[PDB]
Design a protein around this ligand. Structure first.
Ligand code: GEW
Length: 286
């Protein structure tokens, strides 16, 4: 039922295409070769299905195999926060950062409530909705997602060390750089780096080259460990440093206090005099 359009980029696993549901609507299409190596697309599809119904969780319309590809068809979403960041001249107003922070914490909480961690929290994996959902932040891409507790007993996965970094180095938590198994705290710590990225326009560990990838990650790790939160966040409201310190002090199997983290930013929002009219920076482009 689906005509494949132009390739719009790559995902954590497989290629992404702008596509068309010939009968009705435009859609997004993810393809994975059915026989190249270890398969991933069908597991990710199963996670989306477990996530179904949650606020800001995309709907899948069909998932199967068509010839030489495993295919997943997703409702079309709007631009990613990295796209919108570029469109807003790579700087977000405080109001927009706080509006985004409120929803993004909630999306991460939702994923955690369904027993999974995302492990690649970054602007590219959050997309705005379209039409009646144009003010809603969605989260995408479960290719790196992992179950962190047992569905029946809620027994947390064990602590593990000497792991290779998974996800994007720019936003990875310090413990991830140190080879620790990722848990709920790490999704939230990554979000903290995303919010300061939006505030600052960059992070101080961006753009570092080296010979091998290990050395580059090592530079990023060292720069992150050697930059105190009060220096990273210098000049910005204290809530951002409070947020990051809170995430960095969580124990491996701690349940984060998502409400407290949201309340930090909500209190700031109201002390700044902003109104929750869901008018983001991009809503003001002329
Ligand atoms: C209507 O006018 C338009 C004008 C311009 C447009 O764009 C040029 C568009 C198209 C917008 C669009 O892209 N919409 C969209 C995308 C995704 C998606 C999937 C996806 C997932 C599952 C599926 F089944 C299908 C697609 N994967 C992703 N990965 N992004 C990554 C991954 C890894 C990275 F390191 C960085 C970024 N994305 C963004 C899902 C749903 N909607 C429209």
């Amino acid at each position: 039922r689906y005509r494949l359009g132009r390739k719009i980029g790559s995902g954590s696993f497989g290629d992404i295409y702008l596509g068309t549901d010939i009968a009705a609507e435009e859609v997004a299409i993810k393809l994975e070769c059915v026989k190249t190596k270890h398969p991933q697309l069908h597991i990710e599809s199963k996670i989306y299905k477990m996530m179904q119904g949650g606020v800001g969780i995309p709907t899948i319309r069909w998932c199967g195999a068509e010839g030489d590809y495993n295919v997943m068809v997703m409702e079309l979403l709007g631009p990613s926060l990295e796209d919108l960041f570029n469109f807003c001249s790579r700087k977000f107003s405080l109001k927009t950062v706080l509006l985004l922070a409120d929803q993004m914490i909630s999306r991460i909480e939702y994923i955690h409530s369904k027993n999974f961690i995302h492990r690649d929290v970054k602007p590219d994996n959050f997309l705005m909705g379209l039409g009646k959902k144009g003010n809603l932040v969605y989260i995408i891409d479960f290719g790196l997602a992992k179950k962190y507790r047992d569905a029946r007993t809620h027994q947390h996965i064990p602590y593990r060390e000497n792991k290779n970094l998974t996800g994007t180095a720019r936003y990875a938590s310090i413990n991830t750089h140190l080879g620790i198994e990722q848990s709920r705290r790490d999704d939230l710590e990554s979000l903290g780096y995303v919010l300061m990225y939006f505030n600052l326009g960059s992070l101080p560990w961006q753009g570092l080259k080296a010979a091998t990838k290990r050395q580059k990650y090592e530079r990023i790790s060292e720069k992150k460990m050697s930059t105190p939160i009060e220096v990273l966040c210098k000049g910005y409201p204290s809530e951002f440093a409070t947020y990051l310190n809170f995430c960095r002090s969580l124990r491996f199997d701690d349940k984060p206090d998502y409400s407290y983290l949201r309340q930090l930013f909500r209190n700031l929002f109201h002390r700044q005099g902003f109104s929750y009219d869901y008018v983001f920076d991009w809503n003001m482009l002329k």
